[PDB]
Amino acid sequence: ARYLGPKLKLSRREGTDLFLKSGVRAIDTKCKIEQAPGQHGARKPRLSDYGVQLREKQKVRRIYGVLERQFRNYYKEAARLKGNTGENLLALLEGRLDNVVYRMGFGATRAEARQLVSHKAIMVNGRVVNIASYQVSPNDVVSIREKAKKQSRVKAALELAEQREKPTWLEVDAGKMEGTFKRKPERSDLSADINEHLIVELYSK
Amino acid sequence: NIKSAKKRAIQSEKARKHNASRRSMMRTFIKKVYAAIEAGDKAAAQKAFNEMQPIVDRQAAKGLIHKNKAARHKANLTAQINKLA
Amino acid sequence: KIRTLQGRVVSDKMEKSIVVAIERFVKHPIYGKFIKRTTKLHVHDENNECGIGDVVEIRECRPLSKTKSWTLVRVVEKAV
Amino acid sequence: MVTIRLARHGAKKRPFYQVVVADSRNARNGRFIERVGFFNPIASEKEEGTRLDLDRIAHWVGQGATISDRVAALIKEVNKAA
RNA sequence: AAUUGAAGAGUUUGAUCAUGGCUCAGAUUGAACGCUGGCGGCAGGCCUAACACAUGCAAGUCGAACGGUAACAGGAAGAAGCUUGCUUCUUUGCUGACGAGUGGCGGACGGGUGAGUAAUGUCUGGGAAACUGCCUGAUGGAGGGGGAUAACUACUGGAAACGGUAGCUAAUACCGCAUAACGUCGCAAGACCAAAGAGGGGGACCUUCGGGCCUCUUGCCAUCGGAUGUGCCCAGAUGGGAUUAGCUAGUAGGUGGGGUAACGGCUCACCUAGGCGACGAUCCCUAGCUGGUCUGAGAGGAUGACCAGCCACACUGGAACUGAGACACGGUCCAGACUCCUACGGGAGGCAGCAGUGGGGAAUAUUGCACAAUGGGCGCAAGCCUGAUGCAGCCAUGCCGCGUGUAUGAAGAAGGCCUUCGGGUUGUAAAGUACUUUCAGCGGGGAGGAAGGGAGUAAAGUUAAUACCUUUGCUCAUUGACGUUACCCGCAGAAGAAGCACCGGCUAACUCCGUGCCAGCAGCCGCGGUAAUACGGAGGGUGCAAGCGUUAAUCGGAAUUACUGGGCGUAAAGCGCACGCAGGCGGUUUGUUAAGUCAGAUGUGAAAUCCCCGGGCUCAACCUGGGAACUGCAUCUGAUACUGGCAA
């Protein structure tokens, strides 16, 4: 399923930072960013109109760590759901359980916070849930189990997470390590960078 | 064939020899009426009709005749006796 | 109330029987044009009270022969 | 003979019986005249486990209809107070 | 709330715009094949030979119908061995029960297959002339006899299959009489027609000592209903071919007799000379049909595997019997081919039930467990039966979910590759270091699918009866194939777990070496003639991921059959030109009709599916509640502008 590879080569192919690493520092400047994704890295291409639609879909797919069969089912459920299907696809990607626990600060990366929720450690509404792709509804409280609480990793990501922009569609206490998903995140709160309409145009091709 | 319900196969043919005796005696009293109305016998057909009418209705009660065929045999024969004379 | 249909007589020469064509005005499934279709039936009459080419109103009855399941009701617009 | 019996639908190890009015000669999931409710045996202690339209069931037993042992049990189980 | 839904590209030329094919990017599949391969969930799994089948199993049940006793377990006697209070053993249907037999019911259901079938089918909507076991409602009846026959003995034919003679015996088997109706026939008068008893308990009384007698349950018979199932008819719709144009004598119609549960040339005789057909009859080829599925923006196109409805078939062909229901998958009889047995006279068999074998094929699985659940047959029940069904095995066949770690980490290690020889890339990648244990593995806990049924007790009902039975409660002991289940908890250790295609344009992703129109690639343009981003290898990169590519097939793109939605001066395309029948269409005004049309209502359009809002599985796939939808058809009631009819 998952990538299980070098997670800065993916950020160099897209150019921008995908927040795939914890970032105790800033740009690591140990990775040669914005210069070369490969051997022919100085050779920048024409990047045609199909390719600019492919790069934006592969950018969003590499942030959350989903695969294409799982991503195409996200688009398919976003198109039939009422409203703007551009921000409906992002409300479902930000409704993932491994993403919400990242934005609450309990994981330093997406792949680290996926390993917490996959290892039977994180419960929703007082019930233990095991998967990464659990769609959380509004006013659901997600807690951390006491056997994996006090884990030399979960609070260590919490003092790292004051610089992570304070996502204000969910309130986090982080002393008791609980948090509720208040409402769905609107389009005006997601990074101002991704062009979701290129993803809707790529699957209509 | 190798069942235990081949008893039904030997039960069916002894009901066939029972029914074919009753069915042939049922319609040979009908043949007494049809042979009488062709000869012009008015009174001899009426006494022959009165001997098949207990016969054809008793077989309708046993299940050999449906009671719609036994009613059909009495209907067209009285329609055949009265048009004779 | 009885379901009944109109229709004109095509032929009559069959000894207490007449045949009757019924014109229905149906629309095409694909093209949407309205096409006249024909419903030639063998209908029953008693004493031959119908020549050729006149409107006869019919209603459905018990089967009277092989392809004869309709009897006459009345005759309007008798042939001249 | 019309029978009011359970037609087992639902997935493997997760049964879901439809309280249905079918002729006795037909199959279990085969033809029927009417369905008059359902029965969920695995719906354990949550909100809702069984529902039977008892007016239509009482209509069919007035016409003459045998009922199965489970259908006779669910009609008993919708009690006078419960 | 029940839809928010429509992309193009390459290639004719020196170049161009058109026209016009070809090809590609998409989705899908009962898939196959190649490489690869961790787990789980829910599904799916001979598409070809409707070819041939070894073996097991798939339909039995009822003693509360009957004669009974071949076993089984007791009891009662008779013996005698002895343990003198315990034995072995002979009678007894005396009981519990029950082989065989008669009888009742089922075997026509469930299951499988798609050969035939182009309409004797199916779908939708109507109709009348029908039947209908079990179920249920109502009203009544249920009297009195008779003659048999299997079983069982005695004998006998045959190798067997299967018989033959003689003598017995019962019934809810069979037959008659009585008795009848709102039943059948008939205008009426009249005439005629049925049955069957068992079981539990019982006070008083007869008690020939078995029982009569009382009560309850249950079955029987007739008629009329209801419900259900089925038979029949009509209209419309449901494939291709006109290089198939005429077809049909029981044919078309009438009358009359006969048949059917019922209408009918269904059948027969006699009369009439019709009937179908260019709106495609007839003939030929192909084919199960539908709800649906796939695709598509839709209209459409293709399709009918799974699930569900209907039909057809059961070695091939033909036939009827029994029965409420069959012209009968695991019935009969006949013929045929095939296989087997035989004492050569004669017999036996039918997997398109489940599993399986051979064969065919590109290809499709276990000779498994259990009646626990849900159904079905039988039974008063207890129960028995059930390859239906519930599960298990096999298979990446499909869809869905998860894992193969996470975070730091620059000596930018070594190594590989490239270089302009400076470096660059592989690459935070690894190593190192710090953590985590899902899943798999090892132990320990542990739901739910279980409702009932049995025993006992109490109450009510019934009755002469606190008896019995029925009903309602309560108590006790129990009933799970799956299954060392889902799930939860504990232990250990980054430990058990990543491929496949591609990198010239289309089309996301490039350099080096080898080869030199060779070997080869290729879906289309086309690459390869010594400096190949196109061949083979290496490094790098891109795509998708327990899969990935290839082939096959369908739709899309294709507006490239154009109803939506195309064209015909020169690109393909106006008949050489007229006249004219059927057909299609029709100026204008008024009246009328309500057919087309439109509005409303009603019945129906099965369920599943699709869609919408919810619910249950840790989410999802999956399951499920309700609604929408099922563009339809039919009837009824209005509207009268337009179209049509009619009249002027």
PDB file of C-alpha atoms (C1' of nucleotides) in Angstrom, chain E residues 130-248:
ATOM      1  C1'   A E 130     -62.404 -22.700 -15.676  1.00  0.00           C
ATOM      2  C1'   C E 131     -60.444 -25.957 -12.089  1.00  0.00           C
ATOM      3  C1'   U E 132     -58.022 -26.011  -7.307  1.00  0.00           C
ATOM      4  C1'   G E 133     -54.878 -31.145  -2.321  1.00  0.00           C
ATOM      5  C1'   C E 134     -53.305 -29.013   2.141  1.00  0.00           C
ATOM      6  C1'   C E 135     -55.374 -23.699   4.749  1.00  0.00           C
ATOM      7  C1'   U E 136     -59.797 -21.048   6.407  1.00  0.00           C
ATOM      8  C1'   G E 137     -65.296 -19.292   7.027  1.00  0.00           C
ATOM      9  C1'   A E 138     -70.335 -21.046   7.290  1.00  0.00           C
ATOM     10  C1'   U E 139     -74.306 -24.660   7.253  1.00  0.00           C
ATOM     11  C1'   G E 140     -75.441 -29.741   7.692  1.00  0.00           C
ATOM     12  C1'   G E 141     -74.464 -35.059   7.482  1.00  0.00           C
ATOM     13  C1'   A E 142     -71.581 -39.013   9.656  1.00  0.00           C
ATOM     14  C1'   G E 143     -76.986 -44.919   9.305  1.00  0.00           C
ATOM     15  C1'   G E 144     -76.681 -49.991   7.968  1.00  0.00           C
ATOM     16  C1'   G E 145     -73.968 -53.985   5.670  1.00  0.00           C
ATOM     17  C1'   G E 146     -71.062 -56.949   2.051  1.00  0.00           C
ATOM     18  C1'   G E 147     -67.081 -59.180  -0.804  1.00  0.00           C
ATOM     19  C1'   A E 148     -61.913 -59.113  -1.213  1.00  0.00           C
ATOM     20  C1'   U E 149     -56.508 -58.746  -1.126  1.00  0.00           C
ATOM     21  C1'   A E 150     -50.920 -58.180   0.038  1.00  0.00           C
ATOM     22  C1'   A E 151     -48.416 -59.686   4.535  1.00  0.00           C
ATOM     23  C1'   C E 152     -48.060 -64.721   6.432  1.00  0.00           C
ATOM     24  C1'   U E 153     -47.758 -70.472   5.507  1.00  0.00           C
ATOM     25  C1'   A E 154     -47.354 -74.936   1.752  1.00  0.00           C
ATOM     26  C1'   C E 155     -45.357 -75.962  -3.095  1.00  0.00           C
ATOM     27  C1'   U E 156     -42.736 -74.262  -7.440  1.00  0.00           C
ATOM     28  C1'   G E 157     -40.199 -71.534 -12.403  1.00  0.00           C
ATOM     29  C1'   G E 158     -35.591 -68.818 -13.124  1.00  0.00           C
ATOM     30  C1'   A E 159     -28.591 -67.691 -13.224  1.00  0.00           C
ATOM     31  C1'   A E 160     -30.644 -63.159 -11.823  1.00  0.00           C
ATOM     32  C1'   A E 161     -34.333 -59.519 -12.625  1.00  0.00           C
ATOM     33  C1'   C E 162     -38.775 -61.204 -11.579  1.00  0.00           C
ATOM     34  C1'   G E 163     -42.614 -64.720 -10.971  1.00  0.00           C
ATOM     35  C1'   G E 164     -46.670 -69.106 -10.652  1.00  0.00           C
ATOM     36  C1'   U E 165     -50.404 -72.223  -8.111  1.00  0.00           C
ATOM     37  C1'   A E 166     -53.169 -73.369  -3.438  1.00  0.00           C
ATOM     38  C1'   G E 167     -54.998 -71.887   1.492  1.00  0.00           C
ATOM     39  C1'   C E 168     -55.973 -67.964   5.084  1.00  0.00           C
ATOM     40  C1'   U E 169     -56.689 -62.192   7.326  1.00  0.00           C
ATOM     41  C1'   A E 170     -57.541 -56.685   8.696  1.00  0.00           C
ATOM     42  C1'   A E 171     -58.417 -51.468   7.827  1.00  0.00           C
ATOM     43  C1'   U E 172     -59.501 -44.480   7.499  1.00  0.00           C
ATOM     44  C1'   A E 173     -58.213 -49.994   1.163  1.00  0.00           C
ATOM     45  C1'   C E 174     -62.817 -51.530  -2.105  1.00  0.00           C
ATOM     46  C1'   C E 175     -68.183 -51.938  -3.160  1.00  0.00           C
ATOM     47  C1'   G E 176     -73.652 -51.667  -2.228  1.00  0.00           C
ATOM     48  C1'   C E 177     -78.040 -50.206   0.312  1.00  0.00           C
ATOM     49  C1'   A E 178     -80.271 -46.365   3.463  1.00  0.00           C
ATOM     50  C1'   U E 179     -80.318 -41.035   3.726  1.00  0.00           C
ATOM     51  C1'   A E 180     -80.398 -36.268   1.554  1.00  0.00           C
ATOM     52  C1'   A E 181     -80.061 -30.624   0.490  1.00  0.00           C
ATOM     53  C1'   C E 182     -80.013 -23.730  -1.388  1.00  0.00           C
ATOM     54  C1'   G E 183     -76.142 -29.778  -5.115  1.00  0.00           C
ATOM     55  C1'   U E 184     -76.530 -32.052 -10.563  1.00  0.00           C
ATOM     56  C1'   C E 185     -80.063 -32.589 -14.901  1.00  0.00           C
ATOM     57  C1'   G E 186     -84.807 -30.635 -16.353  1.00  0.00           C
ATOM     58  C1'   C E 187     -89.048 -24.796 -18.060  1.00  0.00           C
ATOM     59  C1'   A E 188     -91.297 -27.119 -14.121  1.00  0.00           C
ATOM     60  C1'   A E 189     -93.011 -31.766 -12.235  1.00  0.00           C
ATOM     61  C1'   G E 190     -89.717 -34.978 -10.854  1.00  0.00           C
ATOM     62  C1'   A E 191     -85.303 -38.045 -11.066  1.00  0.00           C
ATOM     63  C1'   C E 192     -80.382 -38.996  -8.921  1.00  0.00           C
ATOM     64  C1'   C E 193     -75.749 -38.723  -6.039  1.00  0.00           C
ATOM     65  C1'   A E 194     -71.534 -39.296  -0.058  1.00  0.00           C
ATOM     66  C1'   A E 195     -68.924 -40.890   3.979  1.00  0.00           C
ATOM     67  C1'   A E 196     -64.373 -43.327   8.351  1.00  0.00           C
ATOM     68  C1'   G E 197     -63.118 -43.901  11.928  1.00  0.00           C
ATOM     69  C1'   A E 198     -59.102 -43.500  15.524  1.00  0.00           C
ATOM     70  C1'   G E 199     -56.797 -41.211  20.182  1.00  0.00           C
ATOM     71  C1'   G E 200     -56.389 -39.336  25.756  1.00  0.00           C
ATOM     72  C1'   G E 201     -59.231 -39.552  30.223  1.00  0.00           C
ATOM     73  C1'   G E 202     -63.553 -40.822  33.121  1.00  0.00           C
ATOM     74  C1'   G E 203     -67.978 -40.751  37.838  1.00  0.00           C
ATOM     75  C1'   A E 204     -72.494 -43.727  38.001  1.00  0.00           C
ATOM     76  C1'   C E 205     -74.497 -47.988  35.416  1.00  0.00           C
ATOM     77  C1'   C E 206     -74.561 -52.627  31.968  1.00  0.00           C
ATOM     78  C1'   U E 207     -69.793 -54.563  32.317  1.00  0.00           C
ATOM     79  C1'   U E 208     -70.947 -61.530  27.687  1.00  0.00           C
ATOM     80  C1'   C E 209     -65.313 -58.612  32.011  1.00  0.00           C
ATOM     81  C1'   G E 210     -62.313 -56.964  25.559  1.00  0.00           C
ATOM     82  C1'   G E 211     -65.929 -53.165  26.306  1.00  0.00           C
ATOM     83  C1'   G E 212     -70.796 -50.483  25.702  1.00  0.00           C
ATOM     84  C1'   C E 213     -71.612 -45.469  28.165  1.00  0.00           C
ATOM     85  C1'   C E 214     -69.836 -39.858  29.138  1.00  0.00           C
ATOM     86  C1'   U E 215     -66.587 -35.928  27.634  1.00  0.00           C
ATOM     87  C1'   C E 216     -62.665 -33.557  24.828  1.00  0.00           C
ATOM     88  C1'   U E 217     -59.171 -33.486  20.724  1.00  0.00           C
ATOM     89  C1'   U E 218     -58.660 -35.098  15.721  1.00  0.00           C
ATOM     90  C1'   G E 219     -60.063 -37.069  11.007  1.00  0.00           C
ATOM     91  C1'   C E 220     -64.313 -38.259   7.252  1.00  0.00           C
ATOM     92  C1'   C E 221     -68.742 -36.529   3.574  1.00  0.00           C
ATOM     93  C1'   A E 222     -71.736 -32.897   0.731  1.00  0.00           C
ATOM     94  C1'   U E 223     -72.847 -27.753  -0.788  1.00  0.00           C
ATOM     95  C1'   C E 224     -71.641 -22.524  -0.991  1.00  0.00           C
ATOM     96  C1'   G E 225     -67.591 -19.071   0.074  1.00  0.00           C
ATOM     97  C1'   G E 226     -62.629 -16.972   0.792  1.00  0.00           C
ATOM     98  C1'   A E 227     -57.479 -17.309   0.040  1.00  0.00           C
ATOM     99  C1'   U E 228     -53.829 -19.528  -3.048  1.00  0.00           C
ATOM    100  C1'   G E 229     -51.994 -22.043  -7.264  1.00  0.00           C
ATOM    101  C1'   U E 230     -52.984 -23.098 -12.324  1.00  0.00           C
ATOM    102  C1'   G E 231     -55.582 -23.530 -17.348  1.00  0.00           C
ATOM    103  C1'   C E 232     -57.545 -20.118 -21.345  1.00  0.00           C
ATOM    104  C1'   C E 233     -58.340 -15.654 -24.508  1.00  0.00           C
ATOM    105  C1'   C E 234     -57.288 -10.656 -26.614  1.00  0.00           C
ATOM    106  C1'   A E 235     -54.386  -5.966 -27.767  1.00  0.00           C
ATOM    107  C1'   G E 236     -49.576  -3.776 -28.032  1.00  0.00           C
ATOM    108  C1'   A E 237     -44.377  -4.519 -27.652  1.00  0.00           C
ATOM    109  C1'   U E 238     -40.430  -8.037 -27.960  1.00  0.00           C
ATOM    110  C1'   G E 239     -33.854 -10.164 -33.414  1.00  0.00           C
ATOM    111  C1'   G E 240     -31.605 -10.475 -38.650  1.00  0.00           C
ATOM    112  C1'   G E 241     -32.373 -11.427 -43.953  1.00  0.00           C
ATOM    113  C1'   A E 242     -36.931  -9.247 -49.862  1.00  0.00           C
ATOM    114  C1'   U E 243     -30.421 -11.790 -53.723  1.00  0.00           C
ATOM    115  C1'   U E 244     -37.221 -15.453 -49.189  1.00  0.00           C
ATOM    116  C1'   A E 245     -43.312 -12.555 -52.604  1.00  0.00           C
ATOM    117  C1'   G E 246     -47.026 -14.962 -52.393  1.00  0.00           C
ATOM    118  C1'   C E 247     -48.698 -18.542 -48.351  1.00  0.00           C
ATOM    119  C1'   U E 248     -52.843 -21.799 -46.505  1.00  0.00           C
TER     120        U E 248
END
